[PDB]
Design an enzyme around this catalytic site. Structure first.
Site, PDB file in Angstrom:
ATOM      1  N   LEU A  53       0.998  -0.909  -0.045  1.00  0.00           N
ATOM      2  CA  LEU A  53       0.000   0.099  -0.017  1.00  0.00           C
ATOM      3  C   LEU A  53       0.922   1.095   0.166  1.00  0.00           C
ATOM      4  O   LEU A  53       2.031   1.230   0.678  1.00  0.00           O
ATOM      5  CB  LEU A  53      -0.711  -0.011   1.235  1.00  0.00           C
ATOM      6  N   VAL A  56       2.832   2.670   3.378  1.00  0.00           N
ATOM      7  CA  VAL A  56       3.167   1.749   4.450  1.00  0.00           C
ATOM      8  C   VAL A  56       4.689   1.061   3.935  1.00  0.00           C
ATOM      9  O   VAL A  56       4.673   0.667   2.750  1.00  0.00           O
ATOM     10  CB  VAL A  56       2.156   0.530   4.351  1.00  0.00           C
ATOM     11  N   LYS A  63       5.846  -3.629  12.264  1.00  0.00           N
ATOM     12  CA  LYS A  63       5.037  -3.435  13.312  1.00  0.00           C
ATOM     13  C   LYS A  63       3.451  -4.061  13.177  1.00  0.00           C
ATOM     14  O   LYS A  63       2.937  -4.556  14.169  1.00  0.00           O
ATOM     15  CB  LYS A  63       4.652  -2.037  13.653  1.00  0.00           C
ATOM     16  N   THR A  92      -2.655  17.737  25.115  1.00  0.00           N
ATOM     17  CA  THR A  92      -2.837  18.077  23.888  1.00  0.00           C
ATOM     18  C   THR A  92      -4.195  17.834  23.154  1.00  0.00           C
ATOM     19  O   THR A  92      -4.662  18.579  22.501  1.00  0.00           O
ATOM     20  CB  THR A  92      -1.917  17.660  22.716  1.00  0.00           C
ATOM     21  N   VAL A  94      -6.606  19.290  24.773  1.00  0.00           N
ATOM     22  CA  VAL A  94      -7.222  20.673  25.089  1.00  0.00           C
ATOM     23  C   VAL A  94      -6.745  21.631  23.788  1.00  0.00           C
ATOM     24  O   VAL A  94      -5.781  21.902  23.720  1.00  0.00           O
ATOM     25  CB  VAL A  94      -6.905  21.336  26.440  1.00  0.00           C
ATOM     26  N   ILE A  97      -3.656  24.059  23.519  1.00  0.00           N
ATOM     27  CA  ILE A  97      -2.473  23.147  23.994  1.00  0.00           C
ATOM     28  C   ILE A  97      -1.836  22.230  23.154  1.00  0.00           C
ATOM     29  O   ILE A  97      -2.660  21.286  22.693  1.00  0.00           O
ATOM     30  CB  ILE A  97      -2.862  22.373  25.470  1.00  0.00           C
ATOM     31  N   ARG A 140     -19.081  14.806  18.596  1.00  0.00           N
ATOM     32  CA  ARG A 140     -19.621  14.947  17.061  1.00  0.00           C
ATOM     33  C   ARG A 140     -20.732  15.709  17.169  1.00  0.00           C
ATOM     34  O   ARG A 140     -21.239  15.883  18.037  1.00  0.00           O
ATOM     35  CB  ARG A 140     -19.667  13.583  16.413  1.00  0.00           C
ATOM     36  N   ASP A 247     -15.718  28.004  12.576  1.00  0.00           N
ATOM     37  CA  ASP A 247     -15.103  28.807  11.932  1.00  0.00           C
ATOM     38  C   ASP A 247     -15.851  29.505  10.829  1.00  0.00           C
ATOM     39  O   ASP A 247     -16.641  29.156  10.090  1.00  0.00           O
ATOM     40  CB  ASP A 247     -13.962  28.135  11.209  1.00  0.00           C
TER      41      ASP A 247
END
Ligand code: NA
Ligand code: NA
EC number: 2.7.7.7
Length: 326
Positions: A53, A56, A63, A92, A94, A97, A140, A247
């Site tokens: 693929l 990869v 792995k 992270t 948050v 952050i 969501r 946004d």
DNA sequence: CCGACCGCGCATCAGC
DNA sequence: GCTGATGCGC
DNA sequence: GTCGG
């Protein structure tokens, strides 16, 4: 669904590289790998199989081999058994952050939401908003709520000035059943790339959205981009809706429909369309479509008055947003 | 082998 | 106070 | 980490 074990692993590895290693390009490699495997129509049976693929390579192949034999990844087990890496990673989540701030907080013992609430003094404005809405931002948005949110945005924009145009883009415009935020593209006849003849075009819209109590908080706002928080009105009897990220980008009108195109996506559709433009002598970015010279030089931006114009230039059957998955 | 890997608007900081 | 760099989220 | 020039 079909290879979720592997793709959870690859995503976990991605978050680690971004947040702990601060290796943004490894993060995006792991993500690219995870997306391509999510799209694969068989149960992966070996690392060699996945390596065929695009995205990869040799390390992810082994792995996968380890994951398939043992069901876990020792590298990830160590990472999760390391108090520092897991706290940096967690923090992270948050909004506001990032890997830098999360590292710094952890270095001085601020490691939990509770820790952040104790030290709210040490947060910037964006981070405080991220903390306040920590749960709600990870939810969501069901499409029916999206549809309600659009009605409000489009109605309220029109109330300031009927000559505004506003489009909600993202996966929502493609008919997605759920969205992660609301992305609104705004434009006006007085704002072209050649002149600004109105001072506060975006401000007037954010201000109207605030006064009807739809926009609740501001993460950042300037002349062309607003990032903030909104909430659907609660219907007196029932539970409140979670707060939502929204946004709003003000785009020059001569660039508006290229913006709609790009921000509607999908990303795989953008890149297949950007590739077909090239083959027929045009280049498309988020702002313009331009013809290519015989030696690869872009000419001037061509006029675009709708999305289909862009399709017309590159001789493509018009593709409705719902059909732009690939 | 070796550099590219989205580019940018805004908030904040760093250095002056 | 100024200008440019950085962090951040997109 | 992977890819392509
Ligand atoms: Na590959
Ligand atoms: Na964050």
């Amino acid at each position: 669904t079909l290879n979720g074990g592997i793709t959870d692993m690859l995503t976990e590895l991605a978050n680690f590289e971004k947040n702990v290693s601060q290796a943004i390009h490894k993060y995006n490699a792991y993500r690219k790998a995870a997306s391509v495997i999510a799209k694969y129509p068989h149960k992966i049976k070996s690392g060699a199989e996945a390596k065929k693929l695009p995205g990869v390579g040799t390390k992810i192949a082994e792995k996968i081999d380890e994951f398939l034999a043992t069901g876990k990844l020792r590298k990830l087990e160590k990472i999760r058994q390391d108090d520092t890496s897991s706290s940096i990673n967690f923090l992270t989540r948050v909004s506001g952050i990032g890997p830098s701030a999360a590292r710094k907080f952890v270095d001085e013992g601020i490691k939990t939401l509770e820790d952040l609430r104790k030290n709210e003094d040490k947060l910037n404005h964006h981070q405080r908003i991220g903390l306040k809405y920590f749960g709600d931002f990870e939810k969501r948005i069901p499409r029916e709520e999206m549809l309600q949110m659009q009605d409000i945005v489009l109605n309220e924009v029109k109330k300031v000035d009927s000559e505004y145009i506003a489009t909600v883009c993202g996966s929502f415009r493609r008919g997605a059943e759920s969205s992660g935020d609301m992305d609104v593209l705004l434009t006006h006849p007085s704002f072209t790339s050649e002149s600004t003849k109105q001072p506060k075009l975006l401000h007037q819209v954010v201000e109207q959205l605030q006064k009807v109590h739809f926009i609740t908080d501001t993460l950042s706002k300037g002349e062309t981009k607003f990032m903030g928080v909104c909430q659907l009105p609660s219907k007196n009897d029932e539970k409140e809706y979670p707060h939502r990220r929204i946004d709003i980008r003000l785009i020059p009108k001569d660039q508006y429909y290229c913006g709609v195109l790009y921000f509607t996506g999908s990303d795989i559709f953008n890149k297949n369309m950007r590739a077909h433009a090239l083959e027929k002598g045009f280049t498309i970015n988020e702002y313009t479509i331009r013809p290519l010279g015989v030696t690869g030089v872009a000419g001037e931006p061509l006029p675009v008055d709708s999305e289909k114009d862009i399709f017309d230039y590159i001789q493509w059957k018009y593709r409705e947003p719902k059909d732009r998955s690939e």
